[PDB]
């Protein structure tokens, strides 16, 4: 399940701006992209969408 575009893991989506890592952009089967913050914690490489518009155009 779940393409790169879709993160299976709520991964502490609360390390907010400055309180956290980069913003990263994903897209669940609701009807929009959802950006989260990575935190320094899940330094998973994060080969993810950087630009909002990429997540949006790629997956919407």
Curated annotation (Swiss-Prot):
Disulfide bonds join 5-59, 15-39, 33-55. CDD domains: Kunitz_TAP-like. One of its GO terms (molecular function) is serine-type endopeptidase inhibitor activity. Keywords: Disulfide bond, Protease inhibitor, Serine protease inhibitor. It comes from the Eukaryota. Residues 5-59 form the BPTI/Kunitz inhibitor domain. InterPro entries: Kunitz_BPTI_sf. The inhibition of factor Xa seems to be reversible and stoichiometric. TAP is a slow, tight-binding inhibitor of blood coagulation, specific for factor Xa. This is Tick anticoagulant peptide. The lineage of its organism: Eukaryota, Metazoa, Ecdysozoa, Arthropoda, Chelicerata.
């Amino acid at each position: 399940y779940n393409r790169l575009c879709i993160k299976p893991r709520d991964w502490i989506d609360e390390c907010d701006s400055n309180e956290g890592g980069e913003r990263a952009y994903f897209r669940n089967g609701k009807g929009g992209c959802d950006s989260f913050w990575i935190c320094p914690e899940d330094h998973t490489g994060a080969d993810y969408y950087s630009s909002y518009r990429d997540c949006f155009n790629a997956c919407i």
